[PDB]
Amino acid sequence: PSLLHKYMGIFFSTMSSEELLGSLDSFDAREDDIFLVSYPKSGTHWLAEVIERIPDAGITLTSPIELGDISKFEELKRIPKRRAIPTHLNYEMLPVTVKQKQCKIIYIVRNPKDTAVSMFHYYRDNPNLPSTETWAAFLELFLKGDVVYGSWFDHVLSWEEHKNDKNVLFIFYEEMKKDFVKSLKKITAFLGIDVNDSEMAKIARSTSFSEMKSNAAKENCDPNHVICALTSDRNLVFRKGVVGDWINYFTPKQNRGFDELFTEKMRNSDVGRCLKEYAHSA
Ligand SMILES: Nc1ncnc2c1ncn2[C@@H]1O[C@H](COP(=O)(O)O)[C@@H](OP(=O)(O)O)[C@H]1O
Ligand SMILES: [Ca+2]
């Protein structure tokens, strides 16, 4: 019985009941709900960890929404507090009802060469993921989208369509590394929360990779809270967390090919070009 399975043409972990997934639009959003959206390996925790570190904001951060049985919906309706709800769903599969309420989205994004790698790595090291021997095997799938949650490019695009909607904010991983505070603001703001220089500086302190990397047990109460449906061992996510490495895995060929598909898919995607002003200088 597989480690992965495919729903509507996209691979998912068997830890996402298909029950759960046919049932999504039966999700009943709250005007206030929040969603931290990303394609795998894209700052997810980073982001989510960052949220939790916001003080007395009143927010219960929630286990992934495409993780589990239909009941997860049950699990969800009982959170009396405001919900920040993590997901890697694509737009289409995002619950209509979320579309209908215009719940705020935060969609975080990172250049796709770095994502691929980070990823490949994740296939290697995670027993919920059917490992792949060599880098080049995984890239082919990536470029096909033959990875869980499907094609990078599609994820981003679908999402990018709503980049100019009011309850939506895009964020760039990269931009998190560069000037984390300018970012944080951008958020606090979207969320219309005030948090001061001191405080913001505390979060920065608390959330540094290596900081985030020192860890082994529990959060605010008892049973471990998972935030990425795929991940059960948080110790697995902190690998290198810089920008750039992809220059230590792409062969001149794979790059040419990559840059052409990229340029083919990300035609006139503003976001496209921004991710290019980065490795442009990076
Ligand atoms: N506080 C932090 N600062 C920078 N990068 C971080 C980080 N926390 C996690 N990461 C990076 O986030 C990536 C994982 O993404 P996700 O949260 O979606 O699973 C990893 O990339 P790397 O493989 O390059 O190290 C990890 O290194
Ligand atoms: Ca459209």
Numbering used by the authors: 7 to 288
What sentences appear in the manuscript?
Cytosolic sulfotransferases (SULTs) are cytosolic enzymes that catalyze the transfer of sulfonate group to key endogenous compounds, altering the physiological functions of their substrates. Enzymatic assays revealed that SULT7A1 is capable of transferring the sulfonate group from 3′-phosphoadenosine 5′-phosphosulfate to the α-carbon of α,β-unsaturated carbonyl-containing compounds, including cyclopentenone prostaglandins as representative endogenous substrates. Since members of the same SULT gene family generally share at least 45% amino acid sequence identity, the newly cloned mouse SULT was judged to belong to a novel SULT family, SULT7, and designated SULT7A1 rather than SULT6B2, as annotated in the NCBI database. Analysis of the amino acid sequence of this novel SULT7A1 showed that it contains a conserved catalytic residue His94 and the signature sequences, called the 5′-phosphosulfate-binding loop, 3′-phosphate-binding loop, and p-loop, that are responsible for the binding to the sulfonate group donor, PAPS.
Although the overall structure of SULT7A1 with 3′-phosphoadenosine-5′-phosphate (PAP) appeared relatively similar to that of mouse SULT1D1, which catalyzes primarily the sulfonation of phenolic compounds, a unique hydrogen bond formed between His94 and Cys234 is present in the active site. It is noted that the Cys234-containing loop (loop-1) occupies the space for a substrate compound docked into the active site. The Cys234-containing loop, however, is flexible based on the high B-factor number. Although loop-1 and segment-1 of SULT1D1 are the key regions forming the substrate entry gate, the flexible loop-1 of SULT7A1 disrupts the entry gate conserved in the other SULTs. Substrate entry gate was not observed in the SULT7A1 structure, but the flexible loop-1 and α-helix following the alternative segment-1 of SULT7A1 may form a potential substrate entry gate. Deleting Cys234 residue appeared to open the substrate entry gate, connecting to active site, formed by the flexible loop-1. Indeed, the C234A mutated SULT7A1 failed to display sulfonating activity toward 2-cylohexenone and 2-cyclopentenone over a wide range of concentrations (1–1,000 μM) tested. In addition to C234A, H51A and H94A also showed no activity to the substrates tested. These findings imply that upon docking of a substrate, the conformation of Cys234-containig loop may be altered and the substrate reaching the active site may then disrupt the hydrogen bound between Cys234 and His94, thereby gaining access to the co-substrate PAPS. It, therefore, appears that His51, His94, and Cys234 are essential residues for the C-sulfonation of α,β-unsaturated carbonyl groups and are critical to the reaction mechanism.
